[PDB]
Every structure is written in structure tokens, then in C-alpha cells.
Amino acid sequence: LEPFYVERYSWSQLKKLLADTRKYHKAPHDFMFVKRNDPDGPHSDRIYYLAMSRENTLFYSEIPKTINRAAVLMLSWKPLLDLYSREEELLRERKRIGTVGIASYDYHQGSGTFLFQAGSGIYHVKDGGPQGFTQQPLRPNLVETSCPNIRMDPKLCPADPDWIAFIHSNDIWISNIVTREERRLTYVHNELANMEEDARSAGVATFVLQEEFDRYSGYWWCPKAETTPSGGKILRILYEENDESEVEIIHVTSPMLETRRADSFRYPKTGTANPKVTFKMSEIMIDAEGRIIDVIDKELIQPFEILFEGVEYIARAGWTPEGKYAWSILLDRSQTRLQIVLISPELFIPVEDDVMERQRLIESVPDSVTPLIIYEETTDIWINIHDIFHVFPQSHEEEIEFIFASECKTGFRHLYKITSILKESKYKRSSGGLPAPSDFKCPIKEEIAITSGEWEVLGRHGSNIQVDEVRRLVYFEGTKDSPLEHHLYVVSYVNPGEVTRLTDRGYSHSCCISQHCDFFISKYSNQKNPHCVSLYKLSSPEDDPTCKTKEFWATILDSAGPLPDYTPPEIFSFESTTGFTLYGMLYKPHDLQPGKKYPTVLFIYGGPQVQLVNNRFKGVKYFRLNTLASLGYVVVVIDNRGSCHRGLKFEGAFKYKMGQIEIDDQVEGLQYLASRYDFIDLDRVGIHGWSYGGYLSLMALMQRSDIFRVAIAGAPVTLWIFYDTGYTERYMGHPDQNEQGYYLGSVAMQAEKFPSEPNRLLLLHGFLDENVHFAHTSILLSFLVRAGKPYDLQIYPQERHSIRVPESGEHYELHLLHYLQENLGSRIAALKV
Amino acid sequence: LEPFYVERYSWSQLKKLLADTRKYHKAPHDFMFVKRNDPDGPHSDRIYYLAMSRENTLFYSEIPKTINRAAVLMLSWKPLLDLYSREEELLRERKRIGTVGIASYDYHQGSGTFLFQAGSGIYHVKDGGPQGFTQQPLRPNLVETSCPNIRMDPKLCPADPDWIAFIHSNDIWISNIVTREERRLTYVHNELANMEEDARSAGVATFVLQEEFDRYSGYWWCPKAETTPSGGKILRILYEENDESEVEIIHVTSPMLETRRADSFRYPKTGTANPKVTFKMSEIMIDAEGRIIDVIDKELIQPFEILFEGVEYIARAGWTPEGKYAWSILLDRSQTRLQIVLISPELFIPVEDDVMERQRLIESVPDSVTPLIIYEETTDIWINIHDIFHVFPQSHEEEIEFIFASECKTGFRHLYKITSILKESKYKRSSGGLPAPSDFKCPIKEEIAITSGEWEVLGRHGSNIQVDEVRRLVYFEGTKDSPLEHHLYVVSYVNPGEVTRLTDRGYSHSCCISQHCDFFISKYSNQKNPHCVSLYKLSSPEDDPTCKTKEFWATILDSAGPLPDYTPPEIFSFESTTGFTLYGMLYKPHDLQPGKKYPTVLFIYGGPQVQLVNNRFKGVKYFRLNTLASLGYVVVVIDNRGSCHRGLKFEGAFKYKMGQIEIDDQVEGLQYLASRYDFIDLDRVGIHGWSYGGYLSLMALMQRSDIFRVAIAGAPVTLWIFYDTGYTERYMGHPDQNEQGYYLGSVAMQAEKFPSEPNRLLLLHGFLDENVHFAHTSILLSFLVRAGKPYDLQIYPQERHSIRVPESGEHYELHLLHYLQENLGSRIAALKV
């Protein structure tokens, strides 16, 4: 063969090319179905959703009772409405929200009350309650406040839509939107105090639980209100209280660089103490008229450590829908033992200073009342937290039924219907001892598996189940038809068997089912077609309600249609020497000259909880992998072992071994291609990735000087001893029980292994990164300098983990092309060597 | 004219080249003469001095009463002795100490008591006092303490050498070194309280005073002790007391990168508040036994803003020889108004909590007693502070004679013998008003200029004046013979005639004159010969005491001989279009070729207070400029207008106009060289400097995008609003009244002016730099990314403003050479364009 050299564009010509290709180019979400219940009118439902017009607001569309099955009905988007703090900027990093405006909302089917934060303000309108359905945009009603700082995480009370709660300065507040009454429920954080002195918070999820467990709230309204004798009621808020006094303090640069100051930050470094956590409960007494009689604040009868021995993370929490028990999913620190636990409000006593008054209240509580561990699972690998957990109405007082999902039985996540016996505990507090390990555990009456197979149910990033308690069905999202396509399925939970698919093959679907289970919405795409949102109607043959079929109904969002100037990559697979099928994407270069070999650029992530290779449209996010092909680079992407959507066995492959397996799969796939395509120049191969991808880019250059000419590492994790507990320990365990794994997985501990030629290493970092701190890069550079190695370095001083400012994104793309051109593809590059 | 191209060495090759040449390659200082008074012994004096054996410690040599004039005598060095915290590490950055061991020392003439810090320890020995002279090394006596943290800045009481003082946690302590008694004199700083809430100090110079006024001390012993009736005595200490509570707080990265924390410290940013400062005095009453009886603390009778209207910085301070008055040099904030001031101890009243006893104490002090301004000068350029100031024993008790130095009168710094009348002031505290700005001023009886001419007396960086009161002479260093050589001069202060030069021309000398004025020591070098140190004997014909002659006496340190593998540069000069002569240094590329033109690297500083071109040995400091010449680069260095040693008009050139002029001079001299020598390729010129030098490198690349191919900016000031008060306001003035100056002199405010070609800009910065904070670089990167301009960046995370870690230095030289080779010198560099 004969080497292809990429054209040598100037920095200003490359800026032009990139700007011209970009000169062209968020879909609906948070859907809600509301019945009109109007016989005379032509509309059966009204659907509300968030979407970009620009800013992000509530829209609505009208679901008609029938359709012209000749034509395609495209629903019109009626606008519903007529319109950053260091708390807003940090939360919108933890959720990975790129949008601006309304991020989420809250609704009360009874009242028709919408409640939503929008900038610094909290608003509320009504629609679809007794007050009817607007035919034009509504003007929102601002909630009044005496509070001086931004109100975070507003929630409607499900039992009373006059009452909302919110967090201000790390304490829970309630406000009545009709009576204008306002009230602070917790006095845990002085806002005037400094960081080190206070370090306490109520109703807020701590950093680790937003970053690594995607849980953002830490208080939960009780769904039912209890009546006082004189025609009032009691409302309940369960909340987690946090004390981060032992948690290590990090400083990270304040975005306003002019100040030259840093922001204090609680970061549980791997090995260090996580925050101290316990449950609490506010009892709020309301009189008949809707004003606050009194607010009792209640603590657990015994300490948290005693009742929930071994629990470190409060992964999830809420209420049974009866309002009877507060439930919670709890992990041990190793993230190998998960427990579902019911907690009676009778476990909470009022907080008292008097030692003799508490011992009085303690005596009042009976020994029968005790935490109930309705479920427990263990794994030699790790427990992946998900959002799937459905509690049924209680038939007998002494059983609870529920659906949960687990990778622990099969090696693959499946739904399971479980009945638990609510036995009274062996243990009595009377004895005055610390309860045994299995003293609170409930017997398992039945454990019916609703699904099974060499495929998994999805329960993260908004994937979930939807139970039809009438037809005794459960809709879920799965990889049953393929690992590269997510599809909607339905199945009986009473007598499970056949698993009916509802989405059409050849597309990967993100799905949302009406609360009435008579409609669903699919956001679907494939490698060649950009995302469409469509609305399908569910009906059953009248001989068997257990059986469900779909009928396309109306389009909510039409695709722009196979984008021109974009050549999609072709998916491939190959059998590993490890006995797994690995999948990849190949961007062949545009205008393929026969008799020529091209420089190959391997883009990588390779970390857990992620899959790059699937049948989705990569034209939006990975448009620049296409642009590289248009300049005459081969671009390769390989989902190596540890990637998600392949079962726990596949994922657990790098437990304790991070950075020691992923590249051997990247190279195995990179060679399977070279053997099959003589147009791949293995002498000019570069690797680029961000975050975990940037990590492996550096491992690629240490482990394999031979294969990879240049590594471009963005926000790389150079030192696992610095990452947080929630993530690092899930995969690497405590650094005492993996001395060697932490050493071999930390690229900064191994700077001598880097090349002694320049123009091979390029390091990129967000200067204000609060997730992968900039000290990963600053400490690797320190050891490269000692080892007399050379590096190239671009800092993005306004950026954090993600790149938000576009000027930054443009510079990153411009530099990356120029760098690959100057140090890989072009003629001048081969001369430099 | 054929282009020469430098041999493209690899990164590993270039590292070897440097390590090989680096494989090849401190003189004595702090000299002090003690007379032996041995009429029968062969030795007249014994000199004590600090030098490197290895550690830096005290040595002595013997001065012969007589010498064989036929031969040279080389004095053998006898060792006198028998063998970092955060605040000791910052002091060494402010002083710019590289050496380890003993930095300075004290000596009580009467007792023979030495006193010196060495690491954490404080030690004393005796030699040359009543107790005679050691023939063998003495053992250092540790001053014991109860003080937890390290002790900074020890000083011997001259009025009793049993007592010493020192600073501990920003308070003044005294310790008797025979009774081991240890007393704390000030209670202004809580070591355990956080620095944000404390920010008060006593006896310490604040940051700007150490950085910009090279004053490293804030307390002063009274040099005589008043006697008591019982037979004890009163010792006194004058001390500056600062409050940094209103001074902006900055965060620099902690050097322990593992912690990912930042150290808070107080930085007076241009235009913000300098610390509130005042004078105080500690009266220590000691008994006849030597035990402390009592300690009264005393404040000024009126606030510092009243007694010293206008004074922003206390520049220097101390006591007159009898200790009748304490004196102080005082600047206004614009540093255009120097005042000298006498403050009687009688101005200080005991500090009393009672509001009514303090009133009885105020009236007790006479209204006659008042601050005495004995000298005031003003300039529309600015005041350069200096260590020259001499007060004569008082003859008339209403007059005071002294010697000061000033550029204000003639435009060059010259000595002046001044008598001032101490007329009791008109202002009275009884009247109870504030004084007019002229009320403490003093009539000026005479003012005889001792020197004059277009050349300056030197009074910075250890240059000072020795004063023979017996013969009424004053020895001083000056630029009279040339700007490129410093020389030792002597002249009468009674009948100031002509100026006898004592040093030999053809060399540049730093000098040090026996307190007896019968000897002097010169450390001297020239462009070709490394620094020597010789001892000369002063002699006068018995007919005329003014006539002064020298005679070589002994070698203290022999030259290392002319170094091989080092060609020196040749000094040049050129008439500027501005009218001034400018000097330069040319390193011709070793092994010149006929007809061939070579790549050129201009090393630059160009800031004030510094001259790079002079007749001193550059073989140590600028060794690598010659290493650049040995590879093929022409190397050029020019002292543009602003640089020191050429008078106040030459310096004042860039008042308010920093950045706007300097490069015109650098390019003028570059073109002068290009006309006379045709080997200077002007199509291949790089510029490189550190700090101000890196600043001008960035200005050269904006302003002259045509003359300069690459710029390599080290630790460069990019935003004058960020730099400190005492420096920026001295030249650029307050920012709100020179708004255009600050804009035009700030490269980051002009990022659009930078090239759009890559491989032309290199930013180098110490990550922990606390002087030119790394925000200068990060904010400039901020604006360069916005503007879409390319840059190369290198960080040194171990280093602050200097480069101390040897591995950081090796990597800097190696990158600097490779970047020059790959982007300026070689043929591949010509292909890149």
C-alpha cells in the first residue's frame, strides 16, 4: 500500500472549515397524560411535556379521540406558559443538564396545580383540574418568600396542594401558596457561619449521591394526611440529615478568575469518611382553616448505625402509596449488600433535650415496632442502583407485595414479584442490647421471576417500569431483542411467560407510558436516522385483556430526515480471545483511494455505566468523528469489557483491575479491522477520549508505545486515590485491599513509562473541574517534569467537567484537528519523526 | 546570504547535551572587621564573614600587621563553628535567598556576642570581645524556648547583649540568653484563630514592604538603655503594628498538591487597601539582677493619620545613635513625597483601657513634644527608596546633622550633608484641632551637596556609605567612571571637593569597608573573568588626611580562571532616535560561517530597578545564552529606557506608559546589529524573558507580529490591575486616573492582537507563583480561547516565582531549546510555515 497524507490546512482555514460545517444543525421530555373526561369534545387526553421552543418551557398538545388513518397527524405544540447561583451551577453539573429554563416540574392530578422552579423564582399555575383546560398560554403565579437566598428542590404536598416544601440554605421550608404562610422546619445550618464550622444539612443529597447514585432530593412528602379530632390534619416530611464534619475539604478555583480565590468543597476522597447520615421526620399539625398549629421534629428511637448495622449510603427513599410505611434502599460501603427497608413513623420520637423525658418517650414506643428488612441481596461483583421499585396496595396487614429488579440471581437485571412476611422482631429494646444481624429480616413468602434470559431490563437514565394493576401487567425497557437496541416490552406479573415487544425493530427507543396505560411515547433513532418522538395508542383484543398491541397515533416530533454532509459509521463485531462478542463503530474515510492506507484515530470511553456502540443516531454528539473521516482519518470506536448493557459478568471484568484490560480489547478490535481492511495505517494510530476515556488514552500510550503514535487525554483520572468513594470503591474496593490495583491503575504513579519523544502526549482539562479535579493533571505533569518527559497542554479556564461555553468547544475542536493533522496525518508529521 | 539551520537533536539527545555541559561548573559576604589590639601579636585585625564551605556558615581570617610585598598572600579560611516552615519559605522568596544555612548574623562590638538563626534554631557564640579570640572552632549555643512554632528575625539588643528579640506567630518576644527568661511583649495575633478573622501583626514587615521596598523587619532595639534609681534599666523596642483586616484575600495553591487545598494570603491589589499601620513602643523594665521587673506597652499620643497626614508606607525606620529620637522614612501612596521624621519616645503614652485615665495621661505629655519632619522631598516621576541615611552625634540640642541621598534635586542620586533646626512646633493638642500639613516641618539650616554629575550614587542591594567621622570623609559606590562598572569612591563631607576613585577600572566591584575605614574588600569581575574577592588597605599621607590611597593586601577568593566552553558576549551601544545611548550584549554564534545568516534569540527583561548589560561575569547566571550561541543562535540583550543605573529621567521614560515604549528600543538595537553584521537573519527572530521579561515578550509578539517569529513568555504579568500596590502605582499610578495606561499595558485585555498561526506563542508559569499569581496566565488563556488564538503552555507545579527544584530547571532548559529548534532554528521549522 502507499500512505495517504491529510491536506495541511492553516489554523485560520481549519477554523473556517469547522465553522462552515457547524453553520447548520432538545426533544420533548417529562411527559404527563391528563384525561379531559368531556363526552362532547374531540380530545381524549392532553399531554404536557418540557421542550426547547431558545429556553426550555412546558408545552401541551391535544390527543384526539380518533384519527384519519389515511394521513399522519403531527400534533402542534401549544405553549402553556408566558414568561446562576453557586447552588444552581453545581446541581446542573451533577444532573448533567445542558438546557436553560424549567428543568423539571411537579403536578397534582386532583387540583391541576403545576409547581416549577424557573430561574430564581418558584411559580404555580393550574390546568386540567376542576378549573378546566386553558386554550392559550397561562401567566404563572410567583410564590412569595421572606427567604433571602435561592429556593432549591420545590415539591407539592401530595396530600394538600396548597402546601409546598423547598430547601433554603440547607434547611427544609414549607410555604402555603393560598395563605401566603411560610415556615422553616429544620434549624440545622446557620448560613451566616463559615464552611468548616457548620458542615450540616437537611433534605439535601450530599455530593457523592448526586454524582455517583443520581439521587438529587433528600426529603419526601408523605402521600397521605392523618386527621386530627377537630377536623384538621397532620402532614409528614421524611428527610435525611447529613453531617459532613469528618469529610475531607477540597478547594477548587472560583469561576470569577479576577478574584483569584477558591471555593471550599466537601469531597469524600477514596478511603476517607463519607458523610454521617440518619433519617428524621417533621410532623406538621394544620388546623381546619389551613394555618400551622405546631411543627414537631422527630428522630429515630435508636441511632441509625444501630438500626441499620453496616449501611453507609441511603441510595433511595420514599413512602408506600398507602402512606403507612416509609421505605428506603440501603447499601453497605463495599456496595455488595443492598437492603429494602420499611420504616414505621412510630419509630420516630420527638427530639428532646431532657434525658429523663426521652427515656419516657422511648418507654412509650412498643417493642413490636421495629425496622422491617423486606429484601436483601449480595454480589461478588457490585450492586448497580436503579429506579425500579413498585409497592402494591396491602391486602393483609402482615404481608407487603412489590416488584424489584436484580442482577444478583441471573447475572442480568430482571424484574421479580416478591411477597414479604411482616413478622414481629425477636429483638426487644427492653433488654437494652444491640440487635443481631438477622433480627429485622423478613421471611420471603414468594419470589416469582417476571423476566429472565441473557439480556437485561433497564432502570437508569429515566428507564423504568409501569404497572397496570387492572390487567396485572408491567411495561419495561429491555435489551432482549439486541444489546444495540433498547425496546419497550410488556408481561403479566401474576402468571409471567411470553414477553410482548411493542417498539418496531431497527430503532433504539426511549419510552414513556401514560399513567392510564392506554398510550405510550417513543423517542427512537438509528445509525442513519435522527431522533423522532411519536405517540402510540395501546388497545387489547376484547377476548384477552392480558394481550396488548400498539397502533401509531400521532407524531410529536418529526426527524429532519437523513442529515446530508453526515456519513454514518457501520457497526461491526468480533470474537475476543476472552470469549465475548465485542461491538465497534468504523468511520471509513470519505473518497477512499484504493492502493492507499490512512491514519487511524481511535475515539474511546471504555468505562462502566456507558455504551458508545449501539444503533442510535451519532450525527448530533459525534459529528466530529464524521468530520475526521471527511479529512481522511479512519475513526474507530470499540465497546470493550466493562461497558454496560451486556450483563454483570461482562461489566465485572475489570473489578480491582481498572486500566489493565480495556486497551487489550481496543487493540484486539483495532487488529481485527486491520486484518480486514488494508486501508488502515497501523503505523499512524492516535487515541483520544474524555474523562475515563482520557484516562485510557494515557494507559494506551504507556502500555503500547508500539501501537498508539499520539494520545489526547481530556480531564483524565491520573490517580484513583483522589476520586470519590461512591465510584472508586464500587470497582476498586478500599485501597488497603487493592494496594497493587490502585498502583497499576494510576497513570501519574507510572510517569517513567511515558515516551521520551515530544508530539505524542496532549493533555486537556477544565480548570474549574470539581468532579475530576485539575490536580489529576497538575500532579501527573509534576511527575512528567521529574521524569524529564515532554507533554503538550491545553487548559480551558472557564470550563468544569463538561464544556458549556461554545468559544471553548470551538477551540477544543480547532486545536484537536490541527494537532492530529500536524502530529499524525499530514506529510510534515512523518518528517518530524 | 544563505540561511543556517541548527542540528535537529532529539529530546533525549538535547537532554544529554545539556547534562554534559551542566556537569561542569557562593563568594563570601556580610564581612566584619574586629581589631585584635595585640601590640605584640602579628595580626592587626580578624575579619568575620559568611561563605559556603555544602552549608553557608561563619568563617574568620587573620589580617597580618605587615606583608611581604614581593608575593601574594591568600588568607586561609578558619571555620568559626563546630558542625522549612511556610513563613521561612516565603521570607526566602521575598529576600530571593538560594543558599541554605546562615543567611545573616548580629555582633555586639562590646561583648563579642554573635547571634544567628540557622534552620529553626537560634544560636550565639562569643569571639573578639573582652574574652579574646578562638584559635579553634566554637560550638553554637542554642537559645532555648517554650515557643511552639518556629522563631523568625532574631536581633541582639545593643544596649545589653544578654537580651535578644524575635517574632513568633506575628508577636514580638524577648529572651535573656543567660537567665533563660522568655517574655512575650505583644498580644496582637491569636496563632490558633483563622487568618481570615485575625490578620493583625506586630514587629513584622507586611508582604508589599518585603516584596517592593526590600524591608524584611518591623521592630528596632533602642541602642542605649536608660538607668533606674534602684540600679536596673529601661530597654526600649520601636515596632510597626499592621492590621490587614481590610486587605483583599487571595488563594494560592498549596505546594502539597495531594491535599488539593489553597493557602489564603493578603495581597494589596493595585487600587485596593494597603494594611492600616502605626508605630508602638515596648518599655521593658529590668532589675539590677537582670530579671524582668515589668513591661509597659505604649501607643502614639495621637493616631498615625493625624501625626503623619499622607503617609501610606513606612519605608525605613530605626534609632539615632544615642537613641534620643527614633527616626522613619515615610512615603505618600503615589510615592512622590518622601518624608524623614524624628519621633521622641515621649510621644508614646501607656495603652490604657480606661477612657478617663487615658485623658489624664494625654494632657501630662508636653504640647512642645511633637513629630519633627527634618527633610521632605517631592518628584513628579517617583521616589526610589534606598538604605543610605547617616545621623551625626548631636552637637547643638536644637539642630541635627545627617547625610541623605536624592534624585529629586539634580535628576541623579547624590549625597547631601543636611543640618535641620528642631524648632518646637506651633500646633498644640490643648487647642484640640488637627495640625496643618506644614505644622511639624523643620527649617533647613544648610544643605551641601557632597556629590553631583550625570552619574548616580548606589544605595540599593547592599550598596551603602561608610562615614569616617575622624577624617570627615564618606566612602560610597557610584557610576561616575561608567554605567557598565560600579566603583568605590571617597570624598570629604566638610569641603566636598573632587571624588577619589579607589577601585581599578576594567572591572565592576561590589565593596565593603572596615568600620575603622582603614581597609576595604572588593568582589569584582568583568565580562571575561569570574568574580574575585581581594582585601585592600587604605592609607593617607600624614601631610593631608583627605588624600586616600589603596594597596593590595591579600586574596580572600581567587578567580576560578577564565572558564573554558564559555565565550563571553561583546558589549555594544547605539544612539537611539530618542536621543539616549542604549547598551547591549551580543553573543555571536560560535564557529561563524562566511556569507551565512543565522537565527536570532533576543533575551529581554526591560523592567525598572534592573540592568542586564554591564561589565560583570555572565558565565554563571546567563551560561545558557552562550549554550544557545554554541548551537547556532545569535543571542542579543538590550537595556531599553526604564532600566536602572542611568538617572531618574532615563528611568521615568515609561511613567504611566509601561509596555508602550520598551519594544521600540529592543527593535531599534536589533536593526542596528542587523546593519553592521549580516549574519543576523531578521526573518527568524525569537524573544524570551521571565516575569517583566515574559510580559515584554508578549507585547513584542502583539506589537511586532512581523519582527518576532516566536515569543516565550515566562511567568508574565498580563493584567496590571492584579499586581500589587507598592510597584504598580509607583509607575502606572492609581488605575482610576491612568485608565488608558492600564488598558494599553495589559496583554490579556488585548488577546485579539495575538497571532492566528500556532507554534509562535509559549507561556511558561510556576503553578504556585505567589508574586505573579498564575491567574495572569490562566486569565490570558481565558481571553485567547474566546479570541480563537492558539497557544502552547508549560506548567511547573513545584515552582513559585523562582525555579528551585533542579529537575524543574533541567526540563525548562530542555523544552526551551527544543521549542526554539523545532519552531525557529532548524529547517523543519522553515517547512512548518
Residue numbers in the entry:
A (entry chain A), B (entry chain B): 48 to 72, 78 to 105, 109 to 138, 148 to 897
Q: Can you list sentences taken from the study reporting this PDB entry?
A:
Dipeptidyl peptidase 9 **(**DPP9) is a serine protease cleaving N-terminal dipeptides preferentially post-proline with (patho)physiological roles in the immune system and cancer. On the molecular level, proteases of the DPPIV family are serine aminopeptidases that remove dipeptides from the N-terminus of substrates having a Pro or an Ala residue in the second position (NH_2_-XaaPro/Ala). DPP8 and DPP9 are the only known intracellular members of this family, both localize to the cytosol, the nucleus and associate with the plasma membrane. Here we identify an association of human DPP9 with the tumour suppressor BRCA2, a key player in repair of DNA double-strand breaks that promotes the formation of RAD51 filaments.
Since DPP8 and DPP9 share a very similar substrate binding mechanisms *in vitro*, and since DPP9 crystals are notorious for being less well ordered, we also tested for a possible interaction between DPP8 and BRCA2. Similarly, in DPP8 all 3 copies of the asymmetric unit exhibit clearly interpretable electron density for the di-peptide. The well-ordered R-segment, a hallmark of ligand binding, was well defined and ordered and supports full occupation of the active sites. There was no trace of electron density for the rest of the peptide ([Fig fig2] and [Table tbl1]). (B) Shown is the N-terminal di-peptide of BRCA2 bound to both DPP9 and to DPP8. Omit map (Fo-Fc; 3σ) of a BRCA2 peptide soaked in DPP8 crystals (C222_1_) and in DPP9 crystals (P12_1_1). The R-Segment and SUBA are highlighted in orange and blue, respectively. For simplification, shown here is a monomer of DPP8.
